[PDB]
Amino acid sequence: GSFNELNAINENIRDDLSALLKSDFFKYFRLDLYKQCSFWDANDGLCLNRACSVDVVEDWDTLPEYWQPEILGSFNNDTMKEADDSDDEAKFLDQLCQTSKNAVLIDLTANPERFTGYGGKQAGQIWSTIYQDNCFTIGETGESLAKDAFYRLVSGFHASIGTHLSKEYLNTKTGKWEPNLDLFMARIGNFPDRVTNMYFNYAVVAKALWKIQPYLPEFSFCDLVNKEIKNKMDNVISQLDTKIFNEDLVFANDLSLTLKDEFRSRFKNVTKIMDCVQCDRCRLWGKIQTTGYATALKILFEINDADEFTKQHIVGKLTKYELIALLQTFGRLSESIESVNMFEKMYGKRL
Numbered sequence: 001g002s003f004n005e006l007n008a009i010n011e012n013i014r015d016d017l018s019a020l021l022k023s024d025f026f027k028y029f030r031l032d033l034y035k036q037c038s039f040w041d042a043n044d045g046l047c048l049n050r051a052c053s054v055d056v057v058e059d060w061d062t063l064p065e066y067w068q069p070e071i072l073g074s075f076n077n078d079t080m081k082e083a084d085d086s087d088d089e090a091k092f093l094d095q096l097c098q099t100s101k102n103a104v105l106i107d108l109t110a111n112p113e114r115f116t117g118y119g120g121k122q123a124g125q126i127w128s129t130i131y132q133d134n135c136f137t138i139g140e141t142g143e144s145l146a147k148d149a150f151y152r153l154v155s156g157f158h159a160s161i162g163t164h165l166s167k168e169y170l171n172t173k174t175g176k177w178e179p180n181l182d183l184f185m186a187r188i189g190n191f192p193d194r195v196t197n198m199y200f201n202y203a204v205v206a207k208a209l210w211k212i213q214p215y216l217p218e219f220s221f222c223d224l225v226n227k228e229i230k231n232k233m234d235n236v237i238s239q240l241d242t243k244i245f246n247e248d249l250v251f252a253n254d255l256s257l258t259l260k261d262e263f264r265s266r267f268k269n270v271t272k273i274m275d276c277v278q279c280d281r282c283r284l285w286g287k288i289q290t291t292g293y294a295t296a297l298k299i300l301f302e303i304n305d306a307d308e309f310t311k312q313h314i315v316g317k318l319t320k321y322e323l324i325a326l327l328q329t330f331g332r333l334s335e336s337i338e339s340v341n342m343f344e345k346m347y348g349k350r351l
């Protein structure tokens with residue numbers, strides 16, 4: 001139901017958000033070179049044999065080398081620049097401009113989240129782990145809800161990826177990246193709740209962005225390149241305003257104090273397992289999108305029972321790294337929400 005509203009919000013906002021997410025400020029993300037998957041130790045089953053790491057959609061053998069998952073889900077060298085202190089990604093928003101007197105940068109706009117062929121049992125297990133580490137301390141005041149929230153979140157993040165991989169599928173025949181209505185239906189379409197969870201997430205990440213807007217410092221005016229950027233982001237955050245934001249989508253007002261952090265743990269601990277993803281491009285976004293939600297949560301759980309002086313520390317002293325993650329995640333969510341509609345039509349003009 002409440003859908004429709006987000007669909008309008010998403011429409012009057014898509015053009016500007018994209019142009020924003022392409023800006024120099026938001027077009028690069030810092031990614032750790034070496035990946036340490038702590039899970040392939042005292043073995044549980046994590047399949048690394050290429051046979052079980054590929055979605056059995058296309059018949060890969062019957063395809064060229066340069067079309068194998070190994071290539072579809074790999075960055076494009078030429079783009080990724082060196083990561084030092086120049087990418088203030090580590091700084092806090094409150095310290096980007098003067099108020100008074102082991103990794104690299106991946107060009108995001110160049111490595112869009114799409115169908116890479118990655119899947120199979122390896123991918124199945126990953127997802128499976130995340131859904132399973134949904135177990136907070138019982139007895140706590142909010143036990144249940146925390147998981148219905150957590151689960152819901154992941155589930156959307158899951159659909160978010162699925163949608164993207166269907167809107168940007170590869171025509172194994174013509175060799176043109178195009179939408180795949182059938183696949184969209186098999187993964188998302190025929191499962192009402194999955195489409196609903198993406199909307200859920202959109203409302204969370206949007207409400208998170210909204211909540212902090214009033215506190216975003218003047219972080220970009222001083223950078224000769226991205227001047228407008230801060231203001232151009234306010235502009236967006238504003239058109240977002242909704243009645244939905246009155247719901248406590250993430251049970252902030254009902255969750256335990258200790259319990260909350262626990263909820264945050266599962267996430268930095270998901271964003272971690274993201275190193276067990278052998279596909280390079282899937283890992284990238286799984287690490288952005290996950291840090292995204294993790295940040296959305298930090299924002300919501302704290303702005304909650306906080307005064308003005310506090311809402312200051314919080315937002316201002318939040319890393320550029322996190323703001324890219326957040327907005328970038330809202331970017332995926334924005335397009336997933338839209339590809340849904342763009343598919344209901346495609347499905348409509350079926351007969």
Ligand SMILES: Cc1cc2nc3c(=O)[nH]c(=O)nc-3n(C[C@H](O)[C@H](O)[C@H](O)COP(=O)(O)OP(=O)(O)OC[C@H]3O[C@@H](n4cnc5c(N)ncnc54)[C@H](O)[C@@H]3O)c2cc1C
Nearest residue numbers: 055114115116117118119120123126155158159165282286
């Ligand atoms: C972090 C991560 C990032 C990935 N990124 C990409 C990518 O960018 N591009 C690409 O082509 N592939 C990507 N994949 C792979 C993709 O998510 C699938 O696993 C894959 O396409 C193979 O699909 P499948 O049908 O085997 O299982 P999936 O469709 O993953 O199914 C896993 C199982 O979970 C259930 N399930 C599916 N969706 C949901 C949901 N939303 N909520 C609750 N349950 C669900 C299914 O019923 C099934 O039991 C990624 C995997 C991980 C773990």
Ligand SMILES: CCN1C(=O)CCC1=O
Nearest residue numbers: 129131132133134135136
């Ligand atoms: C079997 C259910 N469960 C998990 O999935 C992890 C902790 C727990 O008790």
